[PDB]
């Protein structure tokens, strides 16, 4: 039950096509349960408008047993 490294590529794993950038990020995966999470800033378009926003619960950090 220790933290871990993993990489996730929105279109090719989660299957989310709406996110413009980043193509992916590294979130971690922990049985051992995830303790602490953190948001990921992302970019996407509503029509042609580009907007910025943090997606919370995207990045795992502390593991707790």
């Amino acid at each position: 039950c220790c933290l871990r490294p993993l990489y996730i590529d929105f279109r090719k794993d989660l299957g989310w096509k709406w996110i413009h950038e980043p193509k992916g990020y590294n979130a971690n995966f922990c049985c051992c349960v995830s303790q602490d999470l953190e948001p990921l800033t992302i970019v996407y378009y509503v029509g042609r408008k580009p907007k910025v926003e943090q997606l919370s619960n995207m990045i795992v950090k502390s593991c707790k047993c």
């Binding site: 096509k17 709406w18 413009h20 378009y45 509503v46 029509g47």
Partner: protein, 101 residues
């Protein structure tokens, strides 16, 4: 639920004589109304390709989208005067990335 159908606007294209060319567009959008639909238009003077999200009731370029519900975009000549003009419409999510003639 709103579609994603590409909104890369007017762009200069390498599209030419091949049966199908891809929108080389870098942006996939979350259409502003759940009613909407993508269209891809490919006007040929150089050649500009246009990809937007549009509404089936509204007319585009003084033309109206009759096959707006088709799952994959298909181009037919609209015979606008003085130019080679082609248009299409999607009901799928990011339809107009692959254009089929």
């Amino acid at each position: 639920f709103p579609q994603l159908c590409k909104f890369c606007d007017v762009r200069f294209s390498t599209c030419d004589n091949q049966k199908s060319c891809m929108s080389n567009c870098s942006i996939t959008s979350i259409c502003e109304k759940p009613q909407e639909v993508c269209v891809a238009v490919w006007r040929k003077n150089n050649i500009t390709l246009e990809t937007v999200c549009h509404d089936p009731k509204l007319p585009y370029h003084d033309f109206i989208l009759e096959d707006a519900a088709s799952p994959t975009c298909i181009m037919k000549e609209k015979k606008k005067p003085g130019e080679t003009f082609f248009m299409c419409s999607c009901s799928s999510d990011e339809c107009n990335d692959n254009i089929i003639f």
